[PDB]
Design a protein around this ligand. Structure first.
Ligand SMILES: CCCC[C@@H](CN[C@@H](CCCC)C(=O)N[C@@H](CCC(N)=O)C(=O)N[C@@H](CCCNC(N)=[NH2+])C(N)=O)NC(=O)[C@@H](NC(=O)[C@@H](NC(C)=O)[C@@H](C)O)[C@@H](C)CC
Lengths: 99, 99
């Protein structure tokens, strides 16, 4: 799809058997999801942006379906105000910025 | 151009006659730049990100070039970790996300 930017670029995702809404964020290195369960081992991480840092749990090799397109990668889980799809998964679905 | 996301989508901007680096950020409503001097009066604004909220100065109708494309619009100045070009100006330069 071609997504214009008049509004926030929100899409439906499926992760860990759950549907969620998430923001496509070219300004995010990583993908960050609100508290949920995921399989496998994790390690803590601190991630920062506007307003400072939050502590998250890093899970690897997680499959997400993003607007119908499957991707695998690292997902961070923690108290983010918005679910964010970052570059690590945007690349996998072939997303580009065009102007 | 077509900008892939394997690296951060950093571009050169020009504001106040000066060249700066900024991040093209589809997950940002607004454009936020590190402390600098801009002309005119400002109004107060609170913005939020992954770590919480910060106060910024809002300047309107500022002339800015983004990757060689001319825009005129609102620029927020404050303690952002990085210069970000948000949707308010991405729409002026005709940017879309595509996959
Ligand atoms: C400044 C740092 C770079 C840009 C920023 C853009 N992220 C979005 C996420 C939105 C969810 C919180 C953002 O902050 N957007 C703000 C930007 C400010 C602005 N005004 O445009 C926004 O639109 N804020 C809206 C509110 C969004 C609320 N939405 C909602 N409640 N549904 C606003 N009007 O204040 N990226 C990040 O915050 C990411 N940071 C990074 O990628 C890097 N960190 C740093 C410091 O560069 C990396 C080294 O960790 C996070 C997510 C970790 C991977």
């Amino acid at each position: 799809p071609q997504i214009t930017l008049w509004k926030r670029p929100l899409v439906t995702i499926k992760i860990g058997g759950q549907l969620k809404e998430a923001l496509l964020d070219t300004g995010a290195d990583d993908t960050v999801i609100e508290e949920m369960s995921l399989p496998g081992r994790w390690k803590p991480k601190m991630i920062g942006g506007v307003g400072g840092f939050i502590k998250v749990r890093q899970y690897d090799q997680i499959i997400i379906e993003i607007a119908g397109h499957k991707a695998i990668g690292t997902v961070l889980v923690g108290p983010t105000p918005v679910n964010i799809i970052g570059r690590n998964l945007l690349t996998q679905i072939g997303a580009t910025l065009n102007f």
